[PDB]
Amino acid sequence: THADYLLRTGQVVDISDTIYPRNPAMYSEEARLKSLTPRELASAGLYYTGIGDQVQCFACGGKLKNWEPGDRAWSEHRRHFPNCFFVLGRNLN
Amino acid sequence: FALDRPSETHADYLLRTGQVVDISDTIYPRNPAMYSEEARLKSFQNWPDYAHLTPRELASAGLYYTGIGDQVQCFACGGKLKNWEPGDRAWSEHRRHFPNCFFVLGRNLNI
Amino acid sequence: SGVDDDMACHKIPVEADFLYAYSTAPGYYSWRNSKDGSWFIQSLCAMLKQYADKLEFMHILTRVNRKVATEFESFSFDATFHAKKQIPCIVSMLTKELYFY
Amino acid sequence: SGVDDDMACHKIPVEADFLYAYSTAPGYYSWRNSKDGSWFIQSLCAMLKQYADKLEFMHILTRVNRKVATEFESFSFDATFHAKKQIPCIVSMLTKELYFY
Amino acid sequence: SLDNSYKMDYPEMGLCIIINNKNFHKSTGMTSRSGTDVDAANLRETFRNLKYEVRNKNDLTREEIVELMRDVSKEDHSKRSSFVCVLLSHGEEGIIFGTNGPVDLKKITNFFRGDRCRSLTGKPKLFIIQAARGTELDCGIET
Amino acid sequence: SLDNSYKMDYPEMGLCIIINNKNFHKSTGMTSRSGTDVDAANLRETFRNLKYEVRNKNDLTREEIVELMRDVSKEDHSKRSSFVCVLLSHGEEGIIFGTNGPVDLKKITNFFRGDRCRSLTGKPKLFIIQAARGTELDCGIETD
Ligand SMILES: [Zn+2]
Ligand SMILES: [Zn+2]
């Protein structure tokens, strides 16, 4: 199969390294802390979107909002995006 | 075989069919009679006065006296040791000359 | 069709967490004692008995490798099969350490 | 011919003391990042860097197994190759533990 | 850290299937594996002492083995910490023998793939194989 | 303790041959392995920091590889504690590629058999292979 062809010839490659982080601009924590404990969220790689209490991850691009008391940034981040590089520890940029 | 399947290899046959087996378990110990330490101890009835080494240390290393000079033998491997010099520890010498011995290695003898 | 939800689901290889403890290296024969069991199994149990309660599995099986490699050598009246050696083969795809204790 | 000095000659398998650290399980494909190296090597170095001085090799490579199995999943626009996983494969025939420190 | 070693607390320690194949059909051409029982015995004691639920099987056919594995792969290992399978039979590169013929280890193994036996996912699956993987012999080296 | 772990005192730590194959002859049909250099680089740093005598090689042919190994297998590793070889190339079950074709890993490996490289006998010989061993893909399984 064309598919089998592409594989045997080693043309198939994981391009995650060109898709993530979804937002290079919010790569840095400081850049994050720029635009819910700020110092905490930013530390979980989440940056504010300007709407309600809705933040987004620079890595996966996931969105979190409507934070309830007791919600620790980082814990929520991986609960909803357990496959996120930042969450996983996979290299970024 | 060589007549039936001239071009094939008997050895490979015997292996693929799993007929090849290690018979060490029927060769060692070389001397069942000297299996026990007591039986071994009982062999130094005339250990020479000059010696450097007493029966118990030799028997404990699995070696039993042969009745000649200071020449002893291992019940396991059948190896022979003699002309013991001062400082010669039975066990240490035993494995130095027979590092492949079951008793020396800890390979099961028989029970 | 797919959605931008990859990051929302975590997976592990379906082939992960497997451990194959082979008695002999690939392509090689595996020895058995005339009637006293096999070199490998004999060593496996021995090492499991002594270290199950104080060593990680890999290390235990590494003990077995040394035991089989060190204490065994075949004996046959046929020179073709006499004085042969053997090395077990550990194939781990485990993700964590395994302690039986 | 040969002599009966079988008990005085000590040997080790010619195949012993080898360790093959494969990036993927037998029969499987092995992934590479568009241009950022390979999943396996990437993890290998990472784990070697952190633990070379405080862990036995098997355990380090077991760390790599988890890293590759846990933190990686492919991304392709072709569904056929998207969201795929990978498990490295440790093939040890070592007789002792290996510490780099 | 946290969680860098498998969890072995679970109620049960797990199953330890021991397949002991000693006699083979004349149709296979394979000779008996006398002495195999000492192994089957020793393993049983060994793993029982380890608190495993041991289950011995003897002279099964390739079908029986495939079937046995398939069934066991469908039990509910939820409260079990691991799984162990010990194969004692003839074999060659990637093959193990049932009293009536060869089977691919892979076929036996696949029944427990992380996606075919969810009950064991994330848990260590150990396969111990005492069988030939070819006919090469190690001549060894001095030292 | 006695025979618990390999002896790593020996003067030298050992060789770390890194074979980095990036481009292949049109005759092979194999595509390039862009990004392979990042690995070759990273490995070099990693093993240098481990005090290994690293030696990089690039786009070697099956012959060159066989030859390279054969030569290295004949050096005198007496004062070296171990040996490491890292292969980065295309491959399939038991095969690795030289820029001009496949080679059996076994052939590369045999040069260091305990009886063919006495200088390394009893010493750990490590081979790290970053290559495919077939075309199967792990679809994975979900984790609670
Ligand atoms: Zn994220
Ligand atoms: Zn002896």
Q: Which residue does chain C place closest to D95, by CA atoms?
A: C66
Helices (H), chain B: 10-16, 37-41, 55-60, 90-97, 102-105
Hey, are the CB atoms on F141 and C11 less than 8 Å from each other? Answer: yes
C34–B20 CB contact, under 8 Å: no
Q: Where are the domains of chain E?
A: 1-143
Rounded CA-CA distance E17/E112 in Å is: 13
Tell me which chain D residues have a C-beta less than 8 angstroms from the C-beta of A19.
Answer: 75
Subunits with 3+ C-beta pairs closer than 8 A to D: A, B, C, E, F
Chains meeting E at 3+ CB pairs closer than 8 A? Answer: B, C, D, F
Listed by number, the residues of chain D in 20-79 with a beta carbon closer than 8 Å to a beta carbon of chain F are 20-30, 32-38, 40-42, 44-45, 48-49, 52, 56, 73
Counting Cβ atoms within 10 Å, is residue F122 exposed (0-12), middle (13-18) or buried (19+)? Answer: middle
Cα distances (angstroms) measured from residue E123 to each of C18, C41, E16, E36, F80: 9, 23, 14, 29, 39
| Residue (of B101, B105, B45) closest to B78 by Cα position | B101
Ligand 2 midpoint to CA E105 (Å):
41
C-alpha to C-alpha distance for B81 and C74, rounded to whole angstroms: 24
The minimum CA-CA distance between E141 and chain F, rounded to whole Å, is 6
**Structure solved via:** X-ray
**Pairing relation of β-strands E53-58 and E12-20?**
parallel
- Cis amide bond preceding A21, omega within 30: yes
Q: Which amino acid, residue F51?
A: K
DSSP conformational letter for F2: T
**CA dist C86 → C58, E122, E135, F46 (Å):** 18, 32, 12, 34
Residue F39 · residue F108 · CB < 8 Å: no
Q: Where are the alpha helices (DSSP H) in D8-100?
A: 39-51, 57-71
Count of C-beta atoms within a 10 Å radius of residue A69:
4
The verdict on a CB contact (< 8 Å) between D73 and A85 is no
SS3 F72: helix
Distance CA F143, CA F137 (A): 18
How is residue A60 written in tokens?
Answer: 């996966």
CA D83 / ligand 1 centre spacing (Å): 17
Q: Count CA within 13 A, CB hemisphere, residue F110.
A: 8
Q: Provide, for chain F, the percentages of residues in helix, strand and coil under a 3-state DSSP scheme, each rounded to the nearest 5.
A: 25, 30, 45
Find the closest chain F residue to A15 by CA distance: F35
Pair E131, C23: CB distance under 8 Å? yes
Distances (CA, A) of B105 to A65, B74, B99, C66: 68, 13, 7, 12
Is residue F138 within 8 A of residue C15, CB to CB? The reply is yes
What residues pair up with D11 in beta bridges, in sequence order? E142
CA distances from residue F29 to A2, E87, F90, F97, F102 in whole angstroms, order as listed: 14, 41, 11, 12, 12
Query: Per CATH, is E1-143 categorized as 3.40.50.1460?
Result: yes
Please report the number of interchain residue pairs, chain C to chain F, with beta-carbon separation below 8 angstroms: 19
CB C21 within 8 A of CB E129: yes
How far is the C-alpha of A86 from the C-alpha of A64, rounded, in Å? 15
CA C87 to chain centre: 10
| Nearest Cα to Cα of residue A57 among A18, A71, C2, A49 | A49
Q: Do chains B and F touch (3 or more CB pairs under 8 A)?
A: no
CA distance C64 to C58: 10
Bond before B29 cis per omega within 30 degrees: yes
Report all structural domains of chain B as residue ranges with CATH numbers, in order of start. 1-111 (1.10.1170.10)
Q: How far is the CA of D94 from the centre of ligand 2 (A)?
A: 27
Alpha-carbon Rg for chain A, nearest whole angstrom, is: 16
Specify which residues A79 forms β-bridges with: none
- Which helix (H) or strand (E) segment holds residue F92: the answer is strand F91-92
- Distance, CA of B97 to chain centre: 11
Please return the burial class of B46, using the count of CB atoms within 10 Å of its CB with bins 0-12, 13-18 and 19+.
exposed
d(CA D69, CA D85): 7
C8 torsion bin: left (phi>0), alpha (psi -120 to 50), beta (else): alpha
CA atoms within 13 Å, Cβ hemisphere of F142: 5
For domain F1-144, the question of CATH label 2.60.40.60 is answered with no
Q: Which pair of tokens denotes residue A79?
A: 């609960």
Question: Could you count the other beta carbons within 10 Å of the beta carbon of residue C96?
Answer: 20
CA closest to D35 among chain F residues: F35
Q: In chain D, what are the domains? A: 1-101 (3.30.70.1470)
Resolution in A: 2.7
Residue E62: DSSP 8-state = H
Burial category of D81 from C-beta neighbours within 10 Å (exposed 0-12, middle 13-18, buried 19 and up): buried
Token pair 């992934």 in the structure block, residue: D31
Chain C: list its partners (3+ Cβ pairs within 8 Å): A, B, D, E, F
| Secondary structure class of E86 (helix, strand, coil) | strand
Nearest beta carbon to residue B15 from set E29, E33, E135: E135
E13: left (phi over 0), alpha (psi -120 to 50) or beta: alpha
Phi/psi class of residue A12: alpha, beta or left (left: φ > 0; alpha: ψ in -120 to 50)? Answer: beta
Query: Rounded to an integer, what is the distance from CA B13 to the centroid of its chain?
Result: 32
Q: How far apart are CA F83 and CA F76, in angstroms?
A: 12
